[PDB]
Amino acid sequence: VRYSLDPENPTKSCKSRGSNLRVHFKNTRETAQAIKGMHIRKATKYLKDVTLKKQCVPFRRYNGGVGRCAQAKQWGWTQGRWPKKSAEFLLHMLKNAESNAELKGLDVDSLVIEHIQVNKAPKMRRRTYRAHGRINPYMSSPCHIEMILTEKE
Amino acid sequence: QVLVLDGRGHLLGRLAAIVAKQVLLGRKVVVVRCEGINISGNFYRNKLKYLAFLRKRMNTNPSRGPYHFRAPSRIFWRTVRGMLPHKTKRGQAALDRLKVFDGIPPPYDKKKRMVVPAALKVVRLKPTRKFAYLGRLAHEVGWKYQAVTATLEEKRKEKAKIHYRKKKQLMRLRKQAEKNVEKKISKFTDVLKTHGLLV
Amino acid sequence: SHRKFSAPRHGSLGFLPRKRSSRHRGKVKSFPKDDPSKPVHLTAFLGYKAGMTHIVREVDRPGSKVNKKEVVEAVTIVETPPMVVVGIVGYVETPRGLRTFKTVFAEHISDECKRRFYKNWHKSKKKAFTKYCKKWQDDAGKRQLDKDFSSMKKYCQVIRVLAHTQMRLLPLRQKKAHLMEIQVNGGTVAEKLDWARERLEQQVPVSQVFGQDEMIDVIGVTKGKGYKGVTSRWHTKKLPRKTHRGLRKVACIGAWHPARVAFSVARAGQKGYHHRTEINKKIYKIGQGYLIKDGKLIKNNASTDYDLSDKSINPLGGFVHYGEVTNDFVMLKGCVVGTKKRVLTLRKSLLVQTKRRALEKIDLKFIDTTSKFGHGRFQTVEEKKAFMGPLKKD
RNA sequence: CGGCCGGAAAGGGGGCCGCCCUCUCGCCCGUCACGCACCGCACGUUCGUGGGGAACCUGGCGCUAAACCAUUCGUAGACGAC
RNA sequence: CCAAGCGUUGGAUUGUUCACCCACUAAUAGGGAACGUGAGCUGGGUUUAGACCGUCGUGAGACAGGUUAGUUUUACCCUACU
RNA sequence: GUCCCUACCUACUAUCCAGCGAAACCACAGCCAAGGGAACGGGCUUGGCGGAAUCAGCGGGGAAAGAAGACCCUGUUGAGC
RNA sequence: GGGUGGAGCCGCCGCAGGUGCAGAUCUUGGUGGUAGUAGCAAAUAUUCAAACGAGAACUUUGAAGGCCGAAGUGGAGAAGGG
RNA sequence: GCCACUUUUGGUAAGCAGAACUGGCGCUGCGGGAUGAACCGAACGCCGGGUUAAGGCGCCCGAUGCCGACGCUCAUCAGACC
Ligand SMILES: [Mg+2]
Ligand SMILES: [Mg+2]
Ligand SMILES: [Mg+2]
Ligand SMILES: [Mg+2]
Ligand SMILES: [Mg+2]
Ligand SMILES: [Mg+2]
Ligand SMILES: [Mg+2]
Ligand SMILES: [Mg+2]
Ligand SMILES: [Mg+2]
Ligand SMILES: [Mg+2]
Ligand SMILES: [Mg+2]
Ligand SMILES: [Mg+2]
Ligand SMILES: [Mg+2]
Ligand SMILES: [Mg+2]
Ligand SMILES: [Mg+2]
Ligand SMILES: [Mg+2]
Ligand SMILES: [Mg+2]
Ligand SMILES: [Mg+2]
Ligand SMILES: [Mg+2]
Ligand SMILES: [Mg+2]
Ligand SMILES: [Mg+2]
Ligand SMILES: [Mg+2]
Ligand SMILES: [Mg+2]
Ligand SMILES: [Mg+2]
Ligand SMILES: [Mg+2]
Ligand SMILES: [Mg+2]
Ligand SMILES: [Mg+2]
Ligand SMILES: [Mg+2]
Ligand SMILES: [Mg+2]
Ligand SMILES: [Mg+2]
Ligand SMILES: [Mg+2]
Ligand SMILES: [Mg+2]
Ligand SMILES: [Mg+2]
Ligand SMILES: [Mg+2]
Ligand SMILES: [Mg+2]
């Protein structure tokens, strides 16, 4: 399956992909932008104390109504939030990519997330029941994630 | 390449009308001693005009309202930016080349400052009309630093006279040396007098 | 149309950005205007709000109904341990204002004052002023840092000393000592600076700053009351019971055609913790602190010459939410701005004061020291057990 | 090349005293000939060691920190903030 | 005359704007802001459909005549202000 | 406590987070004064001036949103009586 | 021209038309901002340990604390559901 | 249908209503009158050079930065172009 951004060398890059994952796109996009430049061990250590509410995800684009937090000051931002469905799905995806690196025979402790990308998935449908006999749509917004890890010292 | 204008005895808008044009023609202008800018018309009409300008505050947020600058240098700055097209970026790059100063600060005290005869009170008012000092107007409309700047300017004047006495001394040594040297510069002077420089 | 019934507007617009104060320490916006005739003296001091109690004193104002009668009057205790002076700073008058010139610190400054330069004293390695204090112990630096006093004696008009509280002596959890520029108002600038460079790294008590029955100004931040409504903050009229969307509001914000809402209209936001200056607070008594004299300490800093007890200024069970005042204190008339255990600034008065109430001599004759943690019935522990008798536990 | 002063409003690359050196050079007239004379042709001539940004170089003398989160406080507090 | 800095109220009657009166007062001046101000409130009045009375109309019904009961919807957007 | 004259306490909210998450509305959009103008501008003119991204409220303004005005008039459009 | 694409297409002369969109509070389909927002607030209330499990505020068992309180949050019907 | 010079009717009057002559606007840009359906100049294919109209030439803003001419004018509400 063709990814959006080709790696500069497939001999050193290991890749992973998760299609149609039922988490919110706006949370998952920004918790991917949090880790778009990290080492893989620092990335997993980040994603665990995102769940444990000790380091936050700076909500930078999809940020309306998101309340402030004290932990966002270390991202040079005011707003932040600690999502955990998004954290654990692209934590399982790092376990997938880290399995693929040892399948390809790569040095695990030097992997850096080169490219990470969250797209919108085909939006599943539920209904809700509103006043005066009306019914409004109540969709869910799942996401497609792809990710490329790359060895660098 | 930097034009240092004096400010004493110059009319306010008559000076600003040419400071604006030299600034738009790319010439970095620093006017100095904006205390002694004088405005025509008498003091009470000019103070009534500035108090009427103070009345013009925005009703719902006077912090967003017109900033009435009380310093004389910034009164002159605002009356130049009235004459400049300060919304456009050439007018904004124009105002960055005007540099106003209350009194004469030490970057420009030991520099020879220029006078515009075409904007000056003794030239452009007939002498029975009565003018109005911008320094006194700004002071008793609420500029807090008249006496401080007056003592600092008195300190500068009593030091510029120490400079000028030495300049007089050097010119007298020069014109007493020239008579000692007139036997051996008799032919260097004569070719200057035939070409109109020393007679 | 106009208002049918004219009425004065709620609130004052002079205090208008009713926000949280950026400072916790009250800051002196104007020290008293200097004159070269008087001898040199500090013009401000810091203290800590302990609490409130009574006073009984005989009033001498010829003309009132209370001449040679005895009122009671509420007072405020401000614990004021002596402040350590740790620097001076000079100021030169400029046409753009009053610029700072040359700050000169002392040699040895205490590590309760060193706390102030650190947002986290634990994680730090306490390295402040270490390369600076070595200038005082070599001739390469001594001729450097007295040449600048010689320039401060030429180019400075205003010399402000730089003191700090001494929070080792206070009952508080905090150890980070507040520090303050205090303007020295006195003779010429040479006298003014050759007075204070001897006060450098030593004490200044209260009794050589202030005196008794002097009016002073209290600077400080109010007791913060949170994000409160418009009837709680601006005291606007409560709308009647029948209102649909709530009744603790301002009904009409503004008119139609001024198409904004004005800055004068009462709105709902922060109430309290505002910086305030409150003038003409009178010293009734400058207390003397606890000191040990010949084995046993002397404690009676609330004994008057009409009472003759051995009770301290402390009530039974201490000042509620403060602790016990073991230091020399200042007893202000009436209430002052701030909650308990809050830093307050005492400023000498900007005004000249020849009034019949400002020139009044104060000679107290009782100080209430009963328990503030409830309706206190007894002045002291000895009189309490003398009235009660032996208990079950005794 | 070493010392004495001149500076605060937004601080003076200025004057002076010595030294070990060095020169009859510079400036104004003349004498003598040389220096790509690049063959009629454009942005040449400077302030220019320009301002900023990285990596290379060799040496000398010096430096080994705080901030923020997390914990706590409750003089503060919607949440942050303090 | 200079002058809008600061005030200009509490009530009985009426849906009242106006009006009238009691009492204090220093004074109880006049007004403008879409005849300020209903996503601010109230709904007494007018101005729906139910009703009764007078007058007019043969009649359905009509009345700048009276009386009685009669749903007052939404802000999370942007600006403004706090 | 209807008010003078407001104050305090409790529960569920609102607020913050974990998860799940819509709708009305939308020409482009949003800072003001005056001028002229379809005779009341966010846009034009002359000025005032203008600083990322945002949070809790608020009810001035968008002549805010809903509903091809229900009052009035025109219709050679009707119906009930 | 370049790319994708995998089975048909066009120039000229004549002929014929259901022949050209920005609008119709246009018809049908999709998608934004609002927006990670309003909100998920009627009827008092949950807590500890263990088990199964990849996983537990919500399942189950045990204990404890509560409620409906015999006109019930109980036990059984008729209509309806299938 | 509307406006304007002059003639003119009703009305206190109106950016009101009703006429006559002619020109405009509507159907129409452009320079000027800051702003502008109608006023002053002028009506238009796309451009280069020159020159004007009405209006301007302290500065915004092209042009008086003429050694322009003769007077009047002091305003504690100056004055400033159909
Ligand atoms: Mg955003
Ligand atoms: Mg919002
Ligand atoms: Mg619902
Ligand atoms: Mg239903
Ligand atoms: Mg009034
Ligand atoms: Mg109601
Ligand atoms: Mg008490
Ligand atoms: Mg109205
Ligand atoms: Mg309403
Ligand atoms: Mg409204
Ligand atoms: Mg009614
Ligand atoms: Mg009716
Ligand atoms: Mg909310
Ligand atoms: Mg959430
Ligand atoms: Mg524009
Ligand atoms: Mg509105
Ligand atoms: Mg509406
Ligand atoms: Mg209609
Ligand atoms: Mg007809
Ligand atoms: Mg019919
Ligand atoms: Mg096929
Ligand atoms: Mg066909
Ligand atoms: Mg279309
Ligand atoms: Mg189409
Ligand atoms: Mg919410
Ligand atoms: Mg049953
Ligand atoms: Mg059963
Ligand atoms: Mg007419
Ligand atoms: Mg008409
Ligand atoms: Mg025509
Ligand atoms: Mg035309
Ligand atoms: Mg005009
Ligand atoms: Mg004509
Ligand atoms: Mg031409
Ligand atoms: Mg012009």
Phi-psi region of B187 (alpha: psi -120 to 50; beta: other; left: phi over 0): alpha
**What one-character DSSP code corresponds to residue A81?**
B
Let me know: does B16 contact B7? Beta carbons within 8 Å: no
**CA angle at B9 for the pair B8 and B14, rounded to the nearest 5°:** 110
Dihedrals phi, psi of C100, to nearest 5 degrees: -70, 145
- Residue C213 tokens read as 């029955």
Element (H, E) at B80: helix B72-81
**What one-character DSSP code corresponds to residue B103?**
S
Let me know: does A44 contact A25? Beta carbons within 8 Å: no
Q: Which ligand sits nearest to residue A85's alpha carbon?
A: 14
As a whole number of Å, the CA-based R_g of chain A is 17
- Residue B33 tokens read as 């001693």
Parallel/antiparallel/unpaired status of strands B38-39 and A134-137: unpaired
Which nucleotide is at minimal CA–C1' distance from A50? F18
Let me know: does A152 contact A17? Beta carbons within 8 Å: no
Residues 55-114 of chain A within 7 A of strand F, judged by CB, are 60, 63-69, 78-79, 81-86
The size of the B-C interface in CB pairs under 8 A is 24
Nearest to C361, CA basis, from C125, C68, C60, C99: C60
Cα A137 to ligand 24 centre (Å) = 29
Cα B87 to ligand 15 centre (Å) = 12
Question: How distant is the Cα of B136 from the closest Cα of chain C, in angstroms?
Answer: 15
**CA angle at C159 for the pair C156 and C162, rounded to the nearest 5°:** 140
Let me know: does A79 contact A69? Beta carbons within 8 Å: yes
Let me know: does C162 contact C89? Beta carbons within 8 Å: yes
Cα A88 to ligand 22 centre (Å) = 59
SS3 annotation, chain C: CCCCCCCCCCCCHHHCCCCCCCCCCCCCCCCCCCCCCCCCEECEEEEEEEEEECCEEECCCECECCCCCEEECCEEEEECCCEEEEEEEEEEEECCEEEEEEEEECCCCCCCCHHHHCCCCCCCCCCCCHHHHHHHHCHHHHCCCCHHHHHHHHHCCEEEEEEECCHHHCCCCCCCCCEEEEEEECCCHHHHHHHHHHHCCEEECCCCCCCCCCEEEEEEECCCCCEECHHHHCCCCCCCCCCCCCCCCCCCCCCCCCCCCCCCCCCCEECCCCEEEEEEEEEEEECCCCEECCCCEECCCCCCCCCCCCCCCCCCCCECCCECCCCCEEEEECCCCCCCCCEEEEEECCCCCCCCCCCCCCCEEECCCCCCCCCCCCCCHHHHHHHHCCCCCC
Dihedrals phi, psi of C64, to nearest 5 degrees: -85, 175
Q: Are the Cβ atoms of B60 and C96 closer than 8 angstroms?
A: no
Question: How distant is the Cα of B145 from the closest Cα of chain C, in angstroms?
Answer: 6
Q: CA A54 → C1' D77, Å?
A: 21
Residue type, C202: Q
Task: Pick the residue from chain C with its C-alpha nearest to B72.
Answer: C95
- Residue C384 tokens read as 């309490």
Burial status of residue B110 (CB atoms within 10 A of its CB: 0-12, 13-18, 19 or more):
exposed
Question: How distant is the Cα of C303 from the closest Cα of chain B, in angstroms?
Answer: 50
Q: Which of C95, C258, C260 sits opposite B103 (nearest CB)?
A: C95
Cα C237 from Cα C11, distance rounded (Å): 12
| C233 CB below 7 A from strand F atoms | no
- Residue C189 tokens read as 């600038």
Cα C249 from Cα C234, distance rounded (Å): 10
Which nucleotide is at minimal CA–C1' distance from B90? H60
Q: Are the Cβ atoms of B60 and C260 closer than 8 angstroms?
A: yes
Cα C87 from Cα C106, distance rounded (Å): 5
Question: How distant is the Cα of B96 from the closest Cα of chain C, in angstroms?
Answer: 19
* DSSP codes joined into one string, A90-133: HHHHHHHHHHHHHHHT--GGGEEEEEEEEEEPP----EEEETTT
Cα A129 to ligand 26 centre (Å) = 30
- Paired with C270 in beta bridges are C227
> What is the crossing angle of helices C147-155 and C189-199, to 10°?
140
What was the experiment behind these coordinates? Answer: cryo-EM
Q: Are the Cβ atoms of B60 and C262 closer than 8 angstroms?
A: yes
Contact of C33 with chain B, judged by CB distance below 8 Å, is answered with no
Tell me if there are at least 3 CB pairs under 8 Å linking chains B and C.
yes
Going through B44-197 in order, the beta strands assigned E by DSSP cover 98-99, 132-133
- Residue C186 tokens read as 């006195």
Residues 225-244 of chain C within 7 A of strand D, judged by CB, are 225-227
Nearest to A12, CA basis, from A97, A105, A99, A116: A105
Half-sphere exposure of C364 (CA within 13 A, CB side): 26
Let me know: does C22 contact C270? Beta carbons within 8 Å: no
Q: Are the Cβ atoms of B62 and C263 closer than 8 angstroms?
A: yes
Positions of strand E less than 7 angstroms from a protein CB: 6-10, 17-18, 30-43, 73, 78, 80-82
